[PDB]
Design a binder for this molecule. Structure first.
Ligand SMILES: CCC[Si](CCC)(c1ccc(OC[C@@H](O)CCC(=O)O)c(C)c1)c1ccc(OCC(O)(CC)CC)c(C)c1
Lengths: 239, 10
């Protein structure tokens, strides 16, 4: 059932993730320092997000079929998916011991109060925590984790897509790979309705995307706040 | 329009 091409796809996505995710979190020392005291966490979290957008781009470039698209379509897909892929990939450091993102040290252990000290409200933070918990409870294999990130990126219904037919064909190769992987390698009971549960998480991400863009647009409208963002964040999330 | 995204996608 799991064809040789499908095993190839999984191998590439695993390697792409390993080359774009550093579980030592050593680069966090280059960010502007976190200040927990005003939006005191905006500079650190802006650098953290900007750093992760770069990692998301590096992963997306290695998705089988992604570079067959036009440059315009690659840009639309990454602009619309970046915040969602960051939410997905940040689950690797999320802990249910205390509902925090543990990135190796106390300075880099982030909770709900750090998100609020970047300007965001419970309208986003509450559904964000529920999403992180529900995704962690799925206990995805690393193979399913990287497949879900790739499917999120290559979605044909994103606004501004030109060749939606080509985007769908690429995602279909990935969706069938995931569906077959669950039916051959994920033992029950963990596999029960697992594909449908993962597709529900993509729907949850669309709603989280909308609320983040809403709060981002209000935060970035004040020039004092935009001044603390990075050039890449302004290009991807909006100016 | 998106020169930094474009360059990282190169
Ligand atoms: C930190 C608080 C929890 Si966050 C939840 C996840 C989205 C998070 C946690 C860990 C993490 O990175 C860890 C590895 O994944 C990278 C390792 C690697 O790739 O090597 C990242 C990237 C994000 C977060 C941060 C900033 C936010 O807002 C920013 C603005 O909207 C504020 C105007 C725009 C700047 C939001 C809404 C959420």
């Amino acid at each position: 059932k799991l064809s040789e091409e499908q095993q190839h796809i999984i191998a590439i996505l695993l390697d792409a993730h390993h080359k774009t995710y550093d579980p030592t979190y050593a680069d966090f020392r280059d960010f502007r320092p976190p200040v927990r005291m005003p939006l005191s966490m905006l500079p650190h979290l802006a650098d953290l997000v900007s750093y992760s957008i770069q990692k998301v781009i590096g992963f997306a470039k290695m998705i089988p079929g992604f570079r067959d698209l036009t440059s315009d379509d690659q840009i639309v897909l990454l602009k619309s998916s970046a915040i969602e892929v960051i939410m997905l990939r940040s689950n690797q450091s999320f802990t249910m011991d205390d509902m925090s993102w543990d990135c190796g040290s106390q300075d880099y252990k982030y909770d709900v109060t750090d998100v609020s000290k970047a300007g965001h409200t419970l309208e986003l933070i509450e559904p964000l925590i529920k999403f992180q918990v529900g995704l962690k409870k799925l206990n995805l294999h690393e193979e399913e984790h990287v497949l879900l990130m790739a499917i999120c990126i290559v979605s044909p219904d994103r606004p501004g897509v030109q060749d939606a037919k080509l985007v769908e064909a690429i995602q279909d190769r990935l969706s069938n790979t995931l569906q077959t992987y669950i039916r051959c390698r994920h033992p029950p009971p963990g596999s029960h309705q697992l594909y449908a549960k993962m597709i529900q998480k993509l729907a949850d991400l669309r709603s989280l995307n909308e609320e983040h863009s809403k709060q981002y647009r209000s935060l970035s409208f004040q020039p004092e706040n935009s001044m603390k963002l990075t050039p890449l964040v302004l290009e991807v999330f909006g100016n | 329009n998106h020169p930094m995204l474009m360059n990282l996608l190169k």
